[PDB]
Amino acid sequence: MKAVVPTGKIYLGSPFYSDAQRERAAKAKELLAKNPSIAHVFFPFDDGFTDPDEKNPEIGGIRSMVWRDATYQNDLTGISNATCGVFLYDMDQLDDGSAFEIGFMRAMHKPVILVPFTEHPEKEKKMNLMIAQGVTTIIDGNTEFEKLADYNFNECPSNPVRGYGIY
Amino acid sequence: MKAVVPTGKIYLGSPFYSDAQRERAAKAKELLAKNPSIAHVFFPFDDGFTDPDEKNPEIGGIRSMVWRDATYQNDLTGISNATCGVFLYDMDQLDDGSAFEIGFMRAMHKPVILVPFTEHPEKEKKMNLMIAQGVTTIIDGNTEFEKLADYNFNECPSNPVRGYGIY
Amino acid sequence: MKAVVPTGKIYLGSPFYSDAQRERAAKAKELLAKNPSIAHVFFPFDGFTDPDEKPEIGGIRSMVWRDATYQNDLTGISNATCGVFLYDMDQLDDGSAFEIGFMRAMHKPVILVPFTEHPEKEKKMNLMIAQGVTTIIDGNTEFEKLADYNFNECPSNPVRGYGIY
Amino acid sequence: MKAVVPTGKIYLGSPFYSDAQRERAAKAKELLAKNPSIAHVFFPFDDGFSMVWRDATYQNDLTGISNATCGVFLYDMDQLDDGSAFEIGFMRAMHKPVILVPFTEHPEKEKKMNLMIAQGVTTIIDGNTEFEKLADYNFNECPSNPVRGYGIY
Amino acid sequence: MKAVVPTGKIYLGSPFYSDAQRERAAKAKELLAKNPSIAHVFFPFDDGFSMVWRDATYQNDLTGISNATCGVFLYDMDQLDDGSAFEIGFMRAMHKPVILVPFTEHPEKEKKMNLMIAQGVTTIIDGNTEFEKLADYNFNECPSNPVRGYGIY
Amino acid sequence: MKAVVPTGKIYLGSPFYSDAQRERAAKAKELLAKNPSIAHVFFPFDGFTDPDEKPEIGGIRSMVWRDATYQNDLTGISNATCGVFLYDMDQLDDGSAFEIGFMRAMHKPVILVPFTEHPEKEKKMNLMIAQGVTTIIDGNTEFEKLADYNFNECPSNPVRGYGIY
């Protein structure tokens, strides 16, 4: 089933405010860029919509409804265009925006690659059932991050989450 | 458009481990029980699946794949049967399981009622864009919790999230 | 098969500007209200108020009002089991058409109740709509069966007798 | 929680008038009618409507699946019905729960099931052993019950 | 990010052979062909196939919508096409982005749009003012651009 | 309209037990492999390994293997643009049928390539499948066009010449 051309279209989900998270995304892009099976990678934070009537826009502050609708839509559009999702999922500071997108994608029957990260590998290992059962493939970000450059995104082989306590 | 019979089928999403959360759900049920527009309310934590081959099952610990699949499915089945979602959303400790369900439901074009709770009403007021834009109706849990007994679940009038900083 | 309770949940779509439109919708309601297989009926014009909108129908509306109103409609479509469209064949309403496509994409049954006021012109209909709708009830002569139609099962009734384009 | 009123809307999928099958569907209808959690039950063969007949009947079935909240399939394991299988897959794609009720007149034979069906269905109720359960099953919530005990291919 | 290859698959929705319309679709095809982000463009009237013709043609269009990644509609504001509107609603229900390209030969008249269309579409590109943009628009990501400047009803 | 790149993404569904089945699928691949409108082809039997499964085909499989395998198939269906089913009319495969229904619910085009090995029996076909499939290519005499069929657009081709049941 070798692809004649790359067909993997990635929706790269991830927070992007403070460092560490911004760094993860950076390397993620690099790895995916090196992957032969990828045709396109979409990252919600690259572009950005500008609402002419919105003065002194501040991130985290009150935003115009026009900016909100267009930005939210850009993300749903990215999910729509994608064939699969890749989420740089911080296990230390759960991101509800990412979890929402994971559920939205699974509702559309799309495969979802979870790439969990933790700075406390010695602390408890537990995951919410919806995330644990919702994702179709798990790739540890702390010790297997680099396989994003080799994973066959044309078919996304499944790999159930295991080894995590579930609640 | 008065309903001839109750048609609202609620999927009540909410964490249910430690107190406070368990208490919120309790009162939520009571309010919904008093609502004339509700035909059924589903709460994932009421029943529970038992896997005969699973000995000494512990919540938060390793669970059998059979238990995981059946429990996860019970929840998706609840979402499928529901006409709308009601989420007792802890703004202090974001729950990714709930966020996942919100996204799954919105992917199915179903209305979602967000009922946010916060023990720090004086701290910053901010919400993730996906949640803020994804939900169709917001009812403050801290000061408007009781309108769950009167909200017309037969039609779920929209009420966009506003007053929250967005990130 | 004999509903132990009405299960029909109608999304009633139709324009609501002119006296004519308001009329058809008024009778539509009365009829459906007599149908025993209906548990609920939703009509988009029965509204949202944007506290921060200093508003004029047909004018520039706030994005908040637009989002809330558009959603109330999608919400009615989500909740509904089937759609009933008072389709004016003389003044094609793209809002209604949009909704018909939305509902069909969701695989829900759609009942088209067309009106023409101009019998002289050849009865034509766009391909999408002719093929998209699952049941047609002529409004000019069959408007009455909306009170008898079994919305618990929504029997099929292909569109015929219309030039397709 | 306890439903303020019957919420379950069943799409009863089953082959017909080919001996026994007609009997199965018959008893099933009776059992379901005794169930307090059901608001409505649809059976593609009760009511009835060339490419015109085909489309209308096909559509009448998709409409039944659309209005339905869950699917119940009197699944004959001795003669696989692709119509029912198509419908099971259609309902699962819509995220709707599916109750499989397998029947076999040959228990002496291998006990096997296609993976898509075994994993696709959310609840199994054996037709030869617990057919009567259709009258007690809570269709307002359709509790899951994974398929087990079947060799899979 | 920059696509390793054209990813956009356009479903071009437009009325046909009714004067002007044929011209619009014509130029649109040329503009899209110049777009480096497009992998494929489907136009319901190019290729062509009674209830047999109806079903086949209808289906050929739903198949085009299915394979499509986005929708581009040459929307005539002077004569509302319910076919295109049906398709816009169908694509939005599938969560696919829709580019609306409105055209009007009467700018002196009121500027109004039905709410379902104004809110349903995700990106607007005026046909009279910026038709040429179809050649530059990045169809690999379909950036949103909400409808504004239209009275809504 | 002349794809600036192949866009066809086929989900090839079919049983893979007997020599006959393995054959049809083998030729199916070779054919599709010659088609220039295909960008990718997915065949479910090309597998998952459960590290904790001490395994026998057709036997009791671990739930982990079942979930992973079932998902790889749904994943192939999600990624695909259309389905191609080598449908054995003599030994109806409910797994393939399930997938055909799943794909149609997603509104994707489905190409049925039936085989019969028993021309003597009247050509019959279940209603769902006859109406569900969007294009039929006889495998006993038209197997070859899978190498020419334009999967970029997937031209429709209604099922006819089969007793419906």
PDB file of N, CA, C and O in Angstrom, chain A residues 81, chain E residues 9-13 32 42 64-65 68-74 87-88 91-92 96-101 121-123 125 134 137 139 142:
ATOM      1  N   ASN A  81      -9.876  19.656   6.921  1.00  0.00           N
ATOM      2  CA  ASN A  81      -8.932  19.342   5.857  1.00  0.00           C
ATOM      3  C   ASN A  81      -7.990  18.193   6.220  1.00  0.00           C
ATOM      4  O   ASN A  81      -7.539  17.458   5.347  1.00  0.00           O
TER       5      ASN A  81
ATOM      6  N   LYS E   9      -8.967  20.453  -2.868  1.00  0.00           N
ATOM      7  CA  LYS E   9      -9.852  19.755  -3.792  1.00  0.00           C
ATOM      8  C   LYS E   9     -11.159  20.530  -3.766  1.00  0.00           C
ATOM      9  O   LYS E   9     -11.956  20.422  -2.832  1.00  0.00           O
ATOM     10  N   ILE E  10     -11.356  21.326  -4.813  1.00  0.00           N
ATOM     11  CA  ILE E  10     -12.508  22.199  -4.943  1.00  0.00           C
ATOM     12  C   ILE E  10     -13.772  21.633  -5.565  1.00  0.00           C
ATOM     13  O   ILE E  10     -13.736  20.951  -6.591  1.00  0.00           O
ATOM     14  N   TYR E  11     -14.894  21.945  -4.935  1.00  0.00           N
ATOM     15  CA  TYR E  11     -16.189  21.582  -5.465  1.00  0.00           C
ATOM     16  C   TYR E  11     -16.709  22.946  -5.909  1.00  0.00           C
ATOM     17  O   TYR E  11     -17.094  23.770  -5.071  1.00  0.00           O
ATOM     18  N   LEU E  12     -16.687  23.197  -7.214  1.00  0.00           N
ATOM     19  CA  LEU E  12     -17.150  24.469  -7.755  1.00  0.00           C
ATOM     20  C   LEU E  12     -18.653  24.437  -8.000  1.00  0.00           C
ATOM     21  O   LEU E  12     -19.125  23.782  -8.933  1.00  0.00           O
ATOM     22  N   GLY E  13     -19.397  25.153  -7.161  1.00  0.00           N
ATOM     23  CA  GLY E  13     -20.841  25.194  -7.292  1.00  0.00           C
ATOM     24  C   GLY E  13     -21.321  26.429  -8.031  1.00  0.00           C
ATOM     25  O   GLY E  13     -21.052  27.558  -7.618  1.00  0.00           O
ATOM     26  N   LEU E  32      -8.737  29.165 -10.993  1.00  0.00           N
ATOM     27  CA  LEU E  32      -8.401  28.060 -10.100  1.00  0.00           C
ATOM     28  C   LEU E  32      -7.222  27.244 -10.641  1.00  0.00           C
ATOM     29  O   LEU E  32      -6.342  26.824  -9.887  1.00  0.00           O
ATOM     30  N   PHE E  42     -13.654  20.065  -9.176  1.00  0.00           N
ATOM     31  CA  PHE E  42     -14.806  19.348  -9.709  1.00  0.00           C
ATOM     32  C   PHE E  42     -15.920  20.328 -10.044  1.00  0.00           C
ATOM     33  O   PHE E  42     -16.253  21.193  -9.231  1.00  0.00           O
ATOM     34  N   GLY E  64     -18.901  14.442  -5.545  1.00  0.00           N
ATOM     35  CA  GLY E  64     -17.950  15.528  -5.722  1.00  0.00           C
ATOM     36  C   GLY E  64     -17.773  16.267  -4.400  1.00  0.00           C
ATOM     37  O   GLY E  64     -16.676  16.678  -4.034  1.00  0.00           O
ATOM     38  N   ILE E  65     -18.869  16.422  -3.669  1.00  0.00           N
ATOM     39  CA  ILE E  65     -18.826  17.116  -2.389  1.00  0.00           C
ATOM     40  C   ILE E  65     -18.042  16.293  -1.372  1.00  0.00           C
ATOM     41  O   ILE E  65     -17.302  16.839  -0.549  1.00  0.00           O
ATOM     42  N   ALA E  68     -14.335  16.398  -2.186  1.00  0.00           N
ATOM     43  CA  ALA E  68     -13.868  17.770  -2.026  1.00  0.00           C
ATOM     44  C   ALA E  68     -13.375  18.094  -0.619  1.00  0.00           C
ATOM     45  O   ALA E  68     -13.817  17.507   0.368  1.00  0.00           O
ATOM     46  N   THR E  69     -12.449  19.041  -0.539  1.00  0.00           N
ATOM     47  CA  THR E  69     -11.927  19.480   0.743  1.00  0.00           C
ATOM     48  C   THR E  69     -12.620  20.799   1.103  1.00  0.00           C
ATOM     49  O   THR E  69     -12.783  21.137   2.275  1.00  0.00           O
ATOM     50  N   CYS E  70     -13.029  21.545   0.085  1.00  0.00           N
ATOM     51  CA  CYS E  70     -13.700  22.819   0.309  1.00  0.00           C
ATOM     52  C   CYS E  70     -14.685  23.086  -0.819  1.00  0.00           C
ATOM     53  O   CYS E  70     -14.669  22.404  -1.847  1.00  0.00           O
ATOM     54  N   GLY E  71     -15.552  24.071  -0.618  1.00  0.00           N
ATOM     55  CA  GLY E  71     -16.518  24.415  -1.641  1.00  0.00           C
ATOM     56  C   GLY E  71     -16.346  25.862  -2.062  1.00  0.00           C
ATOM     57  O   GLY E  71     -16.076  26.718  -1.228  1.00  0.00           O
ATOM     58  N   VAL E  72     -16.464  26.127  -3.360  1.00  0.00           N
ATOM     59  CA  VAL E  72     -16.359  27.489  -3.895  1.00  0.00           C
ATOM     60  C   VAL E  72     -17.646  27.690  -4.676  1.00  0.00           C
ATOM     61  O   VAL E  72     -17.927  26.942  -5.611  1.00  0.00           O
ATOM     62  N   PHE E  73     -18.432  28.692  -4.296  1.00  0.00           N
ATOM     63  CA  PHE E  73     -19.705  28.923  -4.962  1.00  0.00           C
ATOM     64  C   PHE E  73     -19.846  30.276  -5.649  1.00  0.00           C
ATOM     65  O   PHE E  73     -19.816  31.325  -5.000  1.00  0.00           O
ATOM     66  N   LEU E  74     -19.987  30.236  -6.973  1.00  0.00           N
ATOM     67  CA  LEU E  74     -20.186  31.439  -7.774  1.00  0.00           C
ATOM     68  C   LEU E  74     -21.648  31.744  -7.490  1.00  0.00           C
ATOM     69  O   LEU E  74     -22.540  31.252  -8.177  1.00  0.00           O
ATOM     70  N   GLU E  87     -26.325  22.796  -1.447  1.00  0.00           N
ATOM     71  CA  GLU E  87     -24.955  22.282  -1.399  1.00  0.00           C
ATOM     72  C   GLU E  87     -24.111  22.966  -0.328  1.00  0.00           C
ATOM     73  O   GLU E  87     -23.268  22.340   0.310  1.00  0.00           O
ATOM     74  N   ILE E  88     -24.327  24.256  -0.136  1.00  0.00           N
ATOM     75  CA  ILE E  88     -23.577  24.954   0.882  1.00  0.00           C
ATOM     76  C   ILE E  88     -23.942  24.359   2.244  1.00  0.00           C
ATOM     77  O   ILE E  88     -23.061  24.055   3.042  1.00  0.00           O
ATOM     78  N   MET E  91     -22.401  20.875   2.735  1.00  0.00           N
ATOM     79  CA  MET E  91     -20.975  20.907   3.039  1.00  0.00           C
ATOM     80  C   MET E  91     -20.690  21.414   4.454  1.00  0.00           C
ATOM     81  O   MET E  91     -19.782  20.919   5.127  1.00  0.00           O
ATOM     82  N   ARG E  92     -21.466  22.387   4.914  1.00  0.00           N
ATOM     83  CA  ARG E  92     -21.259  22.903   6.257  1.00  0.00           C
ATOM     84  C   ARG E  92     -21.604  21.835   7.294  1.00  0.00           C
ATOM     85  O   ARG E  92     -20.941  21.728   8.319  1.00  0.00           O
ATOM     86  N   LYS E  96     -17.055  21.130   6.356  1.00  0.00           N
ATOM     87  CA  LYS E  96     -16.115  21.566   5.337  1.00  0.00           C
ATOM     88  C   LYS E  96     -16.206  23.070   5.117  1.00  0.00           C
ATOM     89  O   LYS E  96     -17.283  23.659   5.207  1.00  0.00           O
ATOM     90  N   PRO E  97     -15.065  23.714   4.837  1.00  0.00           N
ATOM     91  CA  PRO E  97     -15.085  25.158   4.611  1.00  0.00           C
ATOM     92  C   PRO E  97     -15.764  25.490   3.287  1.00  0.00           C
ATOM     93  O   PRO E  97     -15.706  24.706   2.335  1.00  0.00           O
ATOM     94  N   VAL E  98     -16.420  26.645   3.240  1.00  0.00           N
ATOM     95  CA  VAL E  98     -17.102  27.083   2.034  1.00  0.00           C
ATOM     96  C   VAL E  98     -16.741  28.517   1.668  1.00  0.00           C
ATOM     97  O   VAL E  98     -16.904  29.443   2.474  1.00  0.00           O
ATOM     98  N   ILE E  99     -16.247  28.693   0.444  1.00  0.00           N
ATOM     99  CA  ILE E  99     -15.877  30.017  -0.052  1.00  0.00           C
ATOM    100  C   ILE E  99     -17.055  30.546  -0.860  1.00  0.00           C
ATOM    101  O   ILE E  99     -17.482  29.916  -1.829  1.00  0.00           O
ATOM    102  N   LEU E 100     -17.604  31.682  -0.453  1.00  0.00           N
ATOM    103  CA  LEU E 100     -18.715  32.242  -1.195  1.00  0.00           C
ATOM    104  C   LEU E 100     -18.167  33.346  -2.084  1.00  0.00           C
ATOM    105  O   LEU E 100     -17.387  34.185  -1.622  1.00  0.00           O
ATOM    106  N   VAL E 101     -18.557  33.329  -3.355  1.00  0.00           N
ATOM    107  CA  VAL E 101     -18.126  34.344  -4.317  1.00  0.00           C
ATOM    108  C   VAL E 101     -19.384  34.973  -4.917  1.00  0.00           C
ATOM    109  O   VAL E 101     -19.827  34.585  -6.000  1.00  0.00           O
ATOM    110  N   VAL E 121     -21.303  30.340   5.420  1.00  0.00           N
ATOM    111  CA  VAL E 121     -20.048  30.393   4.687  1.00  0.00           C
ATOM    112  C   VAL E 121     -18.920  30.799   5.633  1.00  0.00           C
ATOM    113  O   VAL E 121     -19.139  31.532   6.598  1.00  0.00           O
ATOM    114  N   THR E 122     -17.717  30.306   5.362  1.00  0.00           N
ATOM    115  CA  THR E 122     -16.570  30.595   6.209  1.00  0.00           C
ATOM    116  C   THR E 122     -15.641  31.657   5.629  1.00  0.00           C
ATOM    117  O   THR E 122     -14.894  32.294   6.370  1.00  0.00           O
ATOM    118  N   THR E 123     -15.694  31.835   4.312  1.00  0.00           N
ATOM    119  CA  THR E 123     -14.868  32.815   3.620  1.00  0.00           C
ATOM    120  C   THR E 123     -15.627  33.456   2.451  1.00  0.00           C
ATOM    121  O   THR E 123     -16.243  32.759   1.635  1.00  0.00           O
ATOM    122  N   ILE E 125     -15.346  36.037  -0.894  1.00  0.00           N
ATOM    123  CA  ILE E 125     -14.463  36.670  -1.866  1.00  0.00           C
ATOM    124  C   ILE E 125     -15.433  37.282  -2.869  1.00  0.00           C
ATOM    125  O   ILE E 125     -16.100  36.560  -3.600  1.00  0.00           O
ATOM    126  N   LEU E 134      -9.155  34.043  -6.499  1.00  0.00           N
ATOM    127  CA  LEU E 134      -9.263  32.585  -6.552  1.00  0.00           C
ATOM    128  C   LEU E 134      -7.968  31.927  -7.016  1.00  0.00           C
ATOM    129  O   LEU E 134      -7.741  30.738  -6.784  1.00  0.00           O
ATOM    130  N   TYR E 137      -5.659  32.482  -3.465  1.00  0.00           N
ATOM    131  CA  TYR E 137      -6.166  31.915  -2.217  1.00  0.00           C
ATOM    132  C   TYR E 137      -5.500  30.572  -1.894  1.00  0.00           C
ATOM    133  O   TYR E 137      -5.410  29.693  -2.759  1.00  0.00           O
ATOM    134  N   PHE E 139      -5.749  27.252  -0.865  1.00  0.00           N
ATOM    135  CA  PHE E 139      -6.734  26.211  -0.630  1.00  0.00           C
ATOM    136  C   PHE E 139      -6.257  25.041   0.225  1.00  0.00           C
ATOM    137  O   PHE E 139      -7.035  24.124   0.488  1.00  0.00           O
ATOM    138  N   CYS E 142      -7.541  27.187   3.545  1.00  0.00           N
ATOM    139  CA  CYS E 142      -8.785  27.950   3.491  1.00  0.00           C
ATOM    140  C   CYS E 142      -9.009  28.911   4.664  1.00  0.00           C
ATOM    141  O   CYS E 142      -9.964  28.758   5.434  1.00  0.00           O
TER     142      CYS E 142
END
